[PDB]
Amino acid sequence: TGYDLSASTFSPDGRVFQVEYAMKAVENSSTAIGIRCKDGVVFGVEKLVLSKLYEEGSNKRLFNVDRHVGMAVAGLLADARSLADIAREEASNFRSNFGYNIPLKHLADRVAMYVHAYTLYSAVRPFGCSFMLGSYSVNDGAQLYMIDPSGVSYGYWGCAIGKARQAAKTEIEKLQMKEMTCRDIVKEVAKIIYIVHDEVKDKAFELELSWVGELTNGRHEIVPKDIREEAEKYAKESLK
Template sequence: MNSGYDLSASTYSPDGRIFQVEYANKAVENSGTAIGLRVNGGIVLALEKLVHSKLLVPGSNRRIQSVDRHIGMATAGLLADGRHLASRAFDEALNYRETYRAPTTLKALAERLGLYVQAYTLYSSVRPFGVSAVLGAIDKEGPQLYVVEPSGIYHGYHGAAVGKGRQLAKTELEKLKLSEMTIREAVFEAARIIHLCHDDNKDKEFELELSWIGPETNGLHLPVPKDLYEEADKRGRDALDADMED
């Protein structure tokens, strides 16, 4: 059907499509859901990490990573591509600090990452990144949330979702009054949405990953404390059970 137009990322189809980029988006859609919430005073990142083997050590191979002290990144798609992109983001943030003697703004970092990802759609010798990244931070402009997609495009959001359950997650995010929500309330809502999205993929086990940036962390990107994590995880499961009973 594609008549060879999908053999290279540098080849357009007659109707102006780049099939390799569309295939990269499919890789993201086959991954677990990742969401970000920008609320009053902070950022919450949550992720559905599918467990492909019972032999894996719980908590290993994390998909939410810190790329600077105040910046977190959650990735959906190919794990190796996500690690590479996180490493690039770390280098960009470090270079900004060394050049300007100040922490990077998230907008500047998203722009640099977008340019880097887009470069991989220009040459036949490479392939596009099969990953979408949700970036959250608190910088001099306040809480910020961006998404960088496989095409290299990036947008700022109040609430963002990528991965397999992104449509359902976006629907749930649109129902929330994010600007009026506290960061602790956002943690509970994020856990609920991830459990709800996973309900369509019941045959696979998953680990819930949660991190936040806000006054409780002094502006640093850190995992959600164990007691709050366990409470949020339990509330998410209970809310899902209640919906199923209804």
């Protein structure tokens, strides 16, 4: 042993077990999914109810970086909201320096470099977080990026992280995101997490949905209550 302590020591076959351990801690976070529709991006977070003593609307795993940029996280909540702080501050540097809104390709580049900065030293640890970023532009369409604990990002028509990663993304590809205007995306995105985290594992869960596009006028906000009540209306047709 001894080859798996620092973030500066390779393995004898040449890798880092620390980053793999922090990646292993991601699959104990519950589930964070999100796809882009034809004309917008919809995030989806299911949220476990630990005790009844918590208030509804507590400790949200769904963030809001810019007026248009949205964030959904999966990992350690403190490090996640820390990354939301430096990313939000970074977009404030972009608008403060250049005078317009940051694109996702630049933003995820800067955030990913900041994550990669903590992958080199014995003085710091890697983050135990992974998260998804997506927003809409009227000049650039809609984007959808995801960032691992190591600091590698990609574009996606859809992505899924949490416990049931493969058991979530297996059903996402049944959809047709290339044409659906996210109206029905709300119901289907609701259903593909309705079919997971059974009553054996979970006592009770909570739906938490985010929503952005030019139907949202470009601005990012949460879903209204009536639409997700139509999603919960769309819930119990999965028993057939």
